[PDB]
Amino acid sequence: QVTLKESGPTLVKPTQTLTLTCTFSGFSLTTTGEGVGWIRQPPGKALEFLAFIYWNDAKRYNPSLQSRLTITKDASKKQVVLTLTNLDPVDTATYYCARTSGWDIEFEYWGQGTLVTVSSGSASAPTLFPLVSCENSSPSSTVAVGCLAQDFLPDSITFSWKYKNNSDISSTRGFPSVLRGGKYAATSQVLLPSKDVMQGTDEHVVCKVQHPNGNKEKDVPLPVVI
Amino acid sequence: EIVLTQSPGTLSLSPGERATLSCRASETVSNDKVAWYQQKPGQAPRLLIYGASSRATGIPDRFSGSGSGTDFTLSISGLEPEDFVVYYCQQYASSPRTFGQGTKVEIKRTVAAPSVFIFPPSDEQLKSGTASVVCLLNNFYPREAKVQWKVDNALQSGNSQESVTEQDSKDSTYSLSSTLTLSKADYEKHKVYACEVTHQGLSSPVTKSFNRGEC
Numbered sequence: 001q002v003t004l005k006e007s008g009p010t011l012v013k014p015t016q017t018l019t020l021t022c023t024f025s026g027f028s029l030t031t032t033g034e035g036v037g038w039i040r041q042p043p044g045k046a047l048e049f050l051a052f053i054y055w056n057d058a059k060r061y062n063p064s065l066q067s068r069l070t071i072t073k074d075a076s077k078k079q080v081v082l083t084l085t086n087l088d089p090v091d092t093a094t095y096y097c098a099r100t101s102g103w104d105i106e107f108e109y110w111g112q113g114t115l116v117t118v119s120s121g122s123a124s125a126p127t128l129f130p131l132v133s134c135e136n137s138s139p140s141s142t143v144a145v146g147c148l149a150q151d152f153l154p155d156s157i158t159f160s161w162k163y164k165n166n167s168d169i170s171s172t173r174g175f176p177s178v179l180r181g182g183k184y185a186a187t188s189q190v191l192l193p194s195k196d197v198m199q200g201t202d203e204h205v206v207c208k209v210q211h212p213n214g215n216k217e218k219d220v221p222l223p224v225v226i
Numbered sequence: 227e228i229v230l231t232q233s234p235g236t237l238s239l240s241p242g243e244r245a246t247l248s249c250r251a252s253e254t255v256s257n258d259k260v261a262w263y264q265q266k267p268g269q270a271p272r273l274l275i276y277g278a279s280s281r282a283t284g285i286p287d288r289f290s291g292s293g294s295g296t297d298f299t300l301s302i303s304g305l306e307p308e309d310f311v312v313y314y315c316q317q318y319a320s321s322p323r324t325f326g327q328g329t330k331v332e333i334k335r336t337v338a339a340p341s342v343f344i345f346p347p348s349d350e351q352l353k354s355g356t357a358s359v360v361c362l363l364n365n366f367y368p369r370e371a372k373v374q375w376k377v378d379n380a381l382q383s384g385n386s387q388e389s390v391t392e393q394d395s396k397d398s399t400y401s402l403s404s405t406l407t408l409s410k411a412d413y414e415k416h417k418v419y420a421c422e423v424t425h426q427g428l429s430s431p432v433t434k435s436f437n438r439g440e441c
């Protein structure tokens with residue numbers, strides 16, 4: 001089996017320089033037709049090709065990003081390097097490298113990507129706020145409460161909801177994050193049966209998130225129904 | 227500069243049906259050096275077809291490529307569970323290599339109207355100078371929903387984000403959160419907050435709202 005692995009800074013400020021490296025294993029930049037290239041994917045959008053370098057060291061670029069792009073191979077270390085200057089937030093994206101094994105077989109082998117966030121802000125952990133259903137005029141079915149993990153970076157949180165009787169909850173309601181002024185926000189909600197909340201002492205449930213910069217965990221107050 | 231237009235952007239079929247995704251080039255593609263990739267959200271693309279019609283190493287046979295000139299087709303008969311992902315065509319006739327925007331194949335299900343809830347900003351966050359009103363839409367289908375914010379009857383704009391989950395694994399439904407974010411100052415200057423949601427499964431638009439403080 002062939003293999004590629006990318007790596008680089010997971011966070012970087014604009015007006016700067018990104019360097020990524022595709023360490024590959026299973027082939028050498030020597031056969032004809034063979035080549036390797038970098039392709040990125042901005043969150044939620046399409047794949048976009050940056051640069052490609054052939055064995056025989058022939059390099060090819062994406063006009064729109066050329067003169068800002070630079071591609072190089074080191075047969076010595078089995079690792080291709082990409083350089084992007086003048087970083088901008090729009091350059092945030094997952095960066096993949098892949099190998100074309102011949103002339104017709106295009107990118108038959110892909111690395112695995114590495115998300116490179118481009119924010120001037122600094123790696124801050126989440127700050128939590130409870131979301132209590134200001135529900136009524138029909139409580140109905142069941143009651144819902146949330147939790148708003150705010151101002152974090154890089155985008156990388158998880159949610160787990162636990163009870164007072166410290167068990168676990170069935171939320172599944174996790175929304176992808178939205179990028180607001182250099183910082184990412186996310187919401188998580190959870191439905192509990194109207195029958196339970198309109199009873200028990202549980203004056204709350206707790207919201208738990210694990211971001212790599214801190215593992216905060218606020219508690220959200222149920223509403224009291226009956 | 228060979229532009230690639232894929233359509234439809236999103237296609238809604240049932241498991242087992244046949245799917246025909248089209249990819250059209252802005253000019254003829256020399257030698258038909260066109261390729262198709264499949265990507266599940268999260269993972270990396272995987273090659274499905276190259277040279278317009280040649281299958282790849284370890285890629286099933288319901289996947290087939292055809293066409294030439296400026297029209298190409300990736301057809302997959304007998305849609306299987308795992309086939310409901312995104313698909314991209316690419317041309318490598320020149321390089322600049324270029325990609326299409328991708329067409330997503332989703333699971334057709336019946337209409338499910340959403341259940342909606344509105345959450346007022348918490349005092350805590352309020353002390354922080356910024357208040358965030360949220361409106362959650364739960365388990366609905368199809369994906370299209372109009373979610374409008376109104377403050378003291380004023381239609382809002384450029385001050386709400388919007389996030390939507392991927393099609394539910396057990397439900398085939400979607401949920402979405404719409405966030406209205408405004409200055410604590412502005413927030414305390416108004417009385418009634420309302421998010422109106424429009425969806426094919428509601429006979430009439432449902433509006434949810436609360437009055438600052440009375441919650």
Ligand SMILES: *[C@@H]1O[C@H](CO)[C@@H](O[C@@H]2O[C@H](CO)[C@@H](O)[C@H](O)[C@H]2NC(C)=O)[C@H](O)[C@H]1NC(C)=O
Binds near residue numbers: 163164165166196202
């Ligand atoms: C935590 O509190 C809830 C009530 O708010 C408990 O729910 C009830 O107890 C059983 C025991 O597990 C639950 O399975 C049911 O949902 C509820 N019972 C009834 C009458 O249906 C919940 O169980 C508590 N967590 C623990 C420690 O089990």
